[PDB]
């Protein structure tokens, strides 16, 4: 087998909004992970269930590449056992997570002059998400007793709101691109190897 196509995930031109995060399982390939965990051009590199230097002597069945864009303040929430509007309503990691979280500042790519309104997040949900669930629905959230009948109004809000990503934003408010690698093993033979 030849390279795992991790480049086309890290180096994609368009990243997804956190509410509608993208995924791509990797299979039947080999990859050197030092090229990432020694990059230093990633502002964030945290692995939870595994040594990043042990990936080379470890094989797995699948590797999942979840990518999205959140706010700099919220990179804290992309971790096991975290709360907040991102970890509750947009992207949730299991407590028994085995993988690595990789993030970097994209203010120079995703911040626009009058604000970039393409990047959205979910501000309202009735139930907190389950691990690795994705809700892309646009249902008018009921914030009261009076139903909404599919119409936005009083206590009837559109559940998605936008990061107004501007290049003059504070660093905690700047856009950060995220790639979440999830290493999985089951009875299916391991095909993706370090």
């Amino acid at each position, epitope marked *: 087998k030849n390279l795992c196509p991790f480049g086309e995930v890290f180096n994609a031109t368009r990243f997804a909004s956190v509410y509608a995060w993208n995924r791509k399982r990797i299979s039947n390939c080999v990859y050197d992970y030092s090229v990432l965990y020694n990059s230093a051009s990633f502002s964030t590199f945290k692995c939870y269930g595994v040594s990043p230097t042990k990936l080379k002597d470890l094989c797995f069945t699948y590797v999942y590449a979840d990518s999205f864009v959140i706010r700099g303040d919220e990179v804290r929430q992309i971790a096991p056992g975290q709360t907040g509007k991102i970890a509750d309503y947009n992207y949730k990691l299991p407590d028994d997570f085995t993988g690595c979280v990789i993030a970097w500042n994209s203010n120079n790519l995703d911040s*626009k*002059v*009058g604000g*970039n*309104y393409n990047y959205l997040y979910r501000l309202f949900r009735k139930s907190n998400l389950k691990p690795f669930e994705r809700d892309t629905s*646009t249902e008018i959230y009921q914030a009261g007793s009076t139903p909404c009948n599919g*119409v936005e109004g009083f206590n009837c809000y559109f559940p998605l709101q936008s990061y107004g990503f501007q290049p003059t934003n504070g660093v905690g408010y700047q856009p950060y691109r995220v790639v979440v690698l999830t290493f999985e093993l089951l009875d299916a033979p391991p095909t993706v190897c370090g």
Partner: antibody
Amino acid sequence: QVQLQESGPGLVKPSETLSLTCTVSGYSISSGYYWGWIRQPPGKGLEWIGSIYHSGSTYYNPSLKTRVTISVDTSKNQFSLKLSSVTAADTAVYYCARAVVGIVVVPAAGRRAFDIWGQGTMVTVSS
Amino acid sequence: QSALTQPPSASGSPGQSVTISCTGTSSDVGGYNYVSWYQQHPGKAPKLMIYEVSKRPSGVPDRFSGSKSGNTASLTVSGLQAEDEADYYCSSYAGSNNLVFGGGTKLTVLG
């Protein structure tokens, strides 16, 4: 400092295609918002023609969908209006405008309220 | 004629309160809370005064207010000033018909 400016011929021979272009400055159309065209015949009311955002999706006035095309040129930051088979009833002041809402996926997006307007160019349909 | 009824003319006095009505159907003004109000002075572009039924853009004086009741929406202008004499249009989303406009109301200050 979002600004919109209309350009195009002030005269169009009947049954031929009207063509207008709206140049946007101070804000990239790719960044967000819906961009629409509204016309007004002399001494009459406002008629919304259609709206568009940077992907190319469009919503049109039902009384004009067979003759209206709205395009967008993001690399050159403008969006255009083509209206074919014109008559005297198409003689109007044509405005280009920007929607109030920057989010593109809101309900009725591009068919709600319009926030910044151009000064409006007038097209006369005559031989 | 137009998709939304709007009285052709409304006559208020200086400093008083004038209200313009806009009557649609259940498929437009009754159906949704996306009613917009525009001011147009002779020879200049329309100006947004009220959006989303009651919201007011910045700079618009708080003299101008909008509300909705059933299939009828209304814009109210209190403290009528001299430069309030203009044309006024209501707007609404109508589902299949998308954005539809009222015919417009002429407002003249009686002084």
